[PDB]
Design a protein around this ligand. Structure first.
Ligand SMILES: [K+]
Ligand SMILES: [K+]
Ligand SMILES: [K+]
Ligand SMILES: [K+]
Ligand SMILES: [K+]
Ligand SMILES: [K+]
Ligand SMILES: [K+]
Ligand SMILES: [K+]
Ligand SMILES: [K+]
Ligand SMILES: [K+]
Ligand SMILES: [K+]
Ligand SMILES: [K+]
Ligand SMILES: [K+]
Ligand SMILES: [K+]
Ligand SMILES: [K+]
Ligand SMILES: [K+]
Ligand SMILES: [K+]
Ligand SMILES: [K+]
Ligand SMILES: [K+]
Ligand SMILES: [K+]
Ligand SMILES: [Mg+2]
Ligand SMILES: [Mg+2]
Ligand SMILES: [Mg+2]
Ligand SMILES: [Mg+2]
Ligand SMILES: [Mg+2]
Ligand SMILES: [Mg+2]
Ligand SMILES: [Mg+2]
Ligand SMILES: [Mg+2]
Ligand SMILES: [Zn+2]
Lengths: 68, 91, 134, 97, 245, 114
RNA sequence: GCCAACUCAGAACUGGUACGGACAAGGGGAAUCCGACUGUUUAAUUAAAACAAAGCAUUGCGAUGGUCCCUGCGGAUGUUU
RNA sequence: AGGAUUGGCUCUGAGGGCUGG
RNA sequence: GUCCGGUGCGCCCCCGGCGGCCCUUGAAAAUCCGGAGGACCGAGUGCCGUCCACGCCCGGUCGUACUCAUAACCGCAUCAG
RNA sequence: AGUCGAUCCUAAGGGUCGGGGGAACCCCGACAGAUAGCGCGUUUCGCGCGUACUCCGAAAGGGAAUCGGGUUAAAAUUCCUGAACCGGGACGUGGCGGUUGACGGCAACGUUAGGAAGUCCGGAGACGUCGGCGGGGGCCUCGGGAAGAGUUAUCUUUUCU
């Protein structure tokens, strides 16, 4: 597993073809976005829930999204 | 305090093997475990690695010497004889 | 007498260019405020010219006469002074101010390379242009 | 005697003991005479000789090892080489040539 | 009626030498043109201990005369040699301890070790710790040299035979008392299965001529014939004399 | 006080059968195989370790498994000889060549004189 | 100011003088013989004063050699001197 | 070789670390 | 809810660095990494290289239950060995 | 079962070609000898290197790679889920260099990349035993917070997990 520290890099990773699914976990103090790729699972941690909602809105239409 | 009157290093043998043999081996025990002057670096750091092998802890040079001393008595005589013969040949 | 002066050839003793030949450009015997130790600015050879022989073609001769140079400030203790001298003029090309930015360093290195290639093609200073073997 | 002159230099002259200081003086041209002991490593001795030749400075080979040179200098440590920056009351620089 | 221990030695399989940890044979370079006419320089890289051998061995690296590679050799170390020393082998090598020279170039009275018997055999004489050979005289007519071996015997060898200047290092080893059976056990553990030794008079008659009897005793002269068959040749073989000097 | 068992069919405590005790997220202790300690690259001249290279098993140095910067030192004889040894070699080469030139010129001068 | 550990040495008081309270755990001394010592041995009647041992001494041998194995060819000592 | 002591309870003394001019 | 601290000649394992011992100095190879040298090699809006990142496909054969012992082995046994 | 082993390597040693013996079964074992082959470019031919065994021999020596969680009446680091790694193959995209083969640091050295063939060199693998000291992981141990349980004629903010 690998951690992405930027929303921009997270979107770049999610845009590529081999991105299978996106999993969103709702923690008490932050929100985790997980993307399943061929080789690695990429996790982006967002401390503020507003930017988390904006990112969720910004997810590509063709990528499956699940809530945890 | 003076721990042993005369035994010194051979006190490790206790009361075994006889006084004469302990005295005889005392010389070797002292010599082989002592530090020797290093001609190459001018330090008293030459220690025996194995029988006949003497390495310097400081400069790292290793010398082939006596079994229990760095230099045997006959080594100096051999060096002198060889030097004399070489001088005669060169002259 | 002082010998660590400009135009004197030196051998780099440490760093990634250890063993390469270089020529002193500017000598700082007393150092500077940032460097209180004696150092100097040198222009050395990172890639020596290859062996040029008659049987090779003109293109091969031209390619094998190429030279690559580097500019570096080096502590006096990290160079070996030599008795050789290189008279290539680099005062206006290589200076401490050149190292301020990458572009200036590249331009100065290219100009010094051109001058060194010219001198090598002339045929003098054979020792300087042959790599040390060790 | 060389030892007496060295002692006089030590008690009344300027000097530096050691390889690094010797090289520093040779680079700065302050040294006027370099003394090298027999114990000195051959590579170090050759480098010191090359430096002295470049600087046009005389070199004297001490008739002893680093321990003997240090003892002659009046020090309790070994001296592989030394440089005479200024001989106060001695004339080694004049007698040796 | 049983094969005695001395007889069983020859078959081996328990009396073979223990050579697992040895560093290889110690010998000179193969005699070649450079050593026959000039000299070849080598550098001592290491002085090592050879298990089962009192004398230390020296690793010497030579530059191959006609190939682009290193020529590695293992010499019997002469006392006084050290790592980083330059070794010179050849007819024109200087007369200094550690150099290997043809006996023709070694003046009379010199001290040498690892002396060849046949030209090019790479050394068979005076190899043990503290041992040496002495050059006595040269015979230019027949090209032979006389040497004194460690045993005191005088031998004539061709003047082309090589020898290393000086005496073998490690001398004085045997002067130290062992004081205990364990030291002998350790000593012979790396040499061969020849220790401890059982006295013949302690055995039964079936396995030794000295065996048997209601008292411990040989019962007949311990001096035996030179031509006595194996199994009967025990004790003092072909003794010209016995007892103290 | 949980007591453990070997995870493999190796039942002897050899150098290649070393382990560590790790607590799993399941609340239990378990063994895990640990590689034998290996010395890193060493300088043959000084005998000291070569700086800048980690101490791993030989197969862990494989190019496909280790980054190039981790198994290289940017200097002549980098990763093989220490810095001091390389400096000594360079100085020795230069001085020996200079002395060879000096000997040659001295021989030429002597021949000219005679 | 806030924390920290079990070692040591003393002083009162006190019990039916019990208290290393079970457990755990040398009997000691004066001599003679043999073997110096540690070690080993008759698996299933002998553990010993027997064997070995370091130390001492003798004998053969410079490789075309000493000792030994092998029907023969060849081998062990020998990666030796 | 030969002598003395040893429990429980209540105390006393000695033997240290970190922080702050 | 799965939280916050202390303590150590404590016990098992691993590691580091010194010191003692040797007439004892205490394996080899597969494999992997690095280095010395530089024959030879390319273009101007594309060519030559690239141990970089990501992306793609595949990974054979045999063993794998259980006991491991006062009854799962040997001792003629579900034998105090 | 690509990840645990065998399988690979070699140890003491074993088995052999040729040669030498032997009536022969067989004996010695690389010792009496035109070695296996290995690299570069290719009209598949040329060039250059090439010291007579590229065989057997370790489920404790050396050694490519896997971890939790769960699951059966009986299997699991092998089955399920998730998340990794190793070896090999082939390409595509992007990036990197051309001062043809990067940059930075005085230096030790650092940065994910950052030429290269015959030839040569070093290291790791790779090593005894005993003693002290120090570091790490696991265990043991003391206190506080919370959850459950045990005792409660009396005491116990205490006993246990
Ligand atoms: K018989
Ligand atoms: K035996
Ligand atoms: K005996
Ligand atoms: K008898
Ligand atoms: K008798
Ligand atoms: K590095
Ligand atoms: K005992
Ligand atoms: K006994
Ligand atoms: K007994
Ligand atoms: K006996
Ligand atoms: K023989
Ligand atoms: K290279
Ligand atoms: K199984
Ligand atoms: K079993
Ligand atoms: K035949
Ligand atoms: K054979
Ligand atoms: K194995
Ligand atoms: K799993
Ligand atoms: K091993
Ligand atoms: K040790
Ligand atoms: Mg008797
Ligand atoms: Mg025969
Ligand atoms: Mg290169
Ligand atoms: Mg049966
Ligand atoms: Mg045949
Ligand atoms: Mg194979
Ligand atoms: Mg002990
Ligand atoms: Mg405890
Ligand atoms: Zn030294």
């Amino acid at each position: 597993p690998k951690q992405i520290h930027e929303i921009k890099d997270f979107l770049l990773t999610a845009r590529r073809k081999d991105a299978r699914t996106v999993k969103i976990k709702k923690n008490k103090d932050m929100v985790k976005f997980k993307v399943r790729c061929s080789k690695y699972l990429y996790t982006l941690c967002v401390s503020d829930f507003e930017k988390a909602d904006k990112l969720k809105q910004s997810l590509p239409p063709g990528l499956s999204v699940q809530d945890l | 305090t003076k721990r042993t009157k005369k035994a010194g290093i051979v006190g490790k043998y206790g009361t075994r093997y006889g006084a004469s043999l302990r005295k005889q081996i005392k010389k070797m025990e002292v010599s082989q475990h002592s530090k020797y002057f290093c001609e190459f670096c001018g330090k008293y750091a030459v220690k025996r690695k194995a029988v006949g092998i003497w390495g310097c802890k400081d400069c790292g040079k290793v010398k082939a010497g006596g079994a229990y001393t760095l230099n045997t008595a006959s080594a100096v005589t051999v060096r002198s004889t060889i030097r004399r013969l070489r001088e005669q040949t060169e002259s | 007498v002082k010998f660590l002066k400009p135009n004197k050839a030196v051998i780099i003793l440490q760093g990634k260019y250890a063993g390469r030949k270089a020529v002193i450009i500017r000598a700082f015997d007393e150092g500077t405020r940032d460097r209180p130790y004696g150092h100097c600015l040198v222009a050395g050879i990172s890639k020596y010219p290859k062996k040029v022989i008659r049987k090779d073609s003109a293109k091969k001769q031209a390619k094998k006469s190429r030279v690559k140079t580097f500019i570096k400030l080096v502590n006096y203790n990290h160079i070996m002074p030599t008795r050789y001298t290189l008279d290539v003029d680099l005062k206006d090309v290589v200076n401490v101010d050149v190292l301020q930015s990458r572009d200036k360093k590249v331009t100065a290195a290219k100009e010094a390379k051109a001058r060194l290639e010219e001198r090598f093609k002339t045929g003098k200073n054979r020792w300087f242009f042959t790599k040390l073997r060790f | 005697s060389i030892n007496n002159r060295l002692a006089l230099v030590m008690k009344s002259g300027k000097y530096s003991l050691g390889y690094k200081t010797v090289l520093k003086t040779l680079r700065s041209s302050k040294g006027k005479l370099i003394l090298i002991s027999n114990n000195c490593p051959p590579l170090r001795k050759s480098e010191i000789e090359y430096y002295a030749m470049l600087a046009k400075v005389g070199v004297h080979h001490f008739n002893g090892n680093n321990v003997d040179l240090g003892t002659a200098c009046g020090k309790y440590f070994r001296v592989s080489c030394l440089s005479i920056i200024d001989p106060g009351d001695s004339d080694i620089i004049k007698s040796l040539p | 009626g049983r094969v005695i221990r001395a007889q069983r030695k020859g078959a081996g399989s328990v009396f073979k030498s223990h050579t697992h940890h040895r560093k290889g044979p110690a010998k000179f370079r193969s005699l070649d043109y450079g050593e026959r006419n000039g000299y070849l320089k080598g550098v001592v890289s290491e002085i090592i201990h050879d298990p089962g051998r009192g004398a230390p061995l020296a690793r010497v690296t030579f530059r191959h005369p006609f190939r682009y590679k290193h020529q590695k050799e293992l010499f019997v170390a002469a006392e006084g040699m050290y790592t980083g020393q330059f070794i010179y082998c050849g007819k024109k090598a200087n007369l200094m301890v550690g150099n290997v020279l043809a006996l023709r170039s070694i003046p009379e009275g010199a001290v040498v070790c690892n002396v060849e018997h046949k030209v090019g055999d790479r050394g068979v004489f005076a190899r043990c710790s503290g041992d040496y050979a002495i050059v006595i005289s040269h015979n230019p007519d027949n090209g032979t040299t006389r040497i004194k071996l460690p045993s005191g015997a005088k031998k004539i060898v061709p003047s082309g035979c090589r020898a290393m200047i000086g005496q073998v290092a490690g001398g004085g080893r045997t002067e130290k008392p062992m004081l205990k059976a364990g030291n002998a056990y350790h000593k012979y553990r790396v040499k061969r299965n020849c220790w401890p030794k059982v006295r013949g008079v302690a055995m039964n008659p079936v396995e030794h001529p000295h065996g048997g009897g209601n008292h411990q005793h040989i019962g007949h002269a311990s001096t035996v014939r030179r031509d006595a068959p194996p199994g009967q040749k025990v004790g003092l073989i072909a003794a010209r004399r016995t007892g103290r000097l | 006080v949980q007591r453990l068992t070997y995870r493999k069919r190796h039942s002897y405590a050899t150098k290649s059968n070393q382990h560590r005790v790790v607590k799993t997220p399941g609340g239990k202790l378990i063994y895990q195989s640990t590689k034998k300690r290996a010395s890193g690259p060493k300088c043959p001249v000084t005998g000291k370790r070569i700086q800048g290279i980690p101490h791993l098993r030989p197969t862990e140095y494989k190019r496909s498994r280790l980054s190039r910067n981790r198994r290289t030192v940017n200097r002549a004889y980098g990763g093989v000889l220490s810095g001091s040894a390389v400096r000594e070699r360079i100085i020795r080469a230069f001085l020996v060549e200079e002395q060879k030139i000096v000997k040659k010129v001295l021989k030429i001068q002597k021949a000219k004189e005679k």
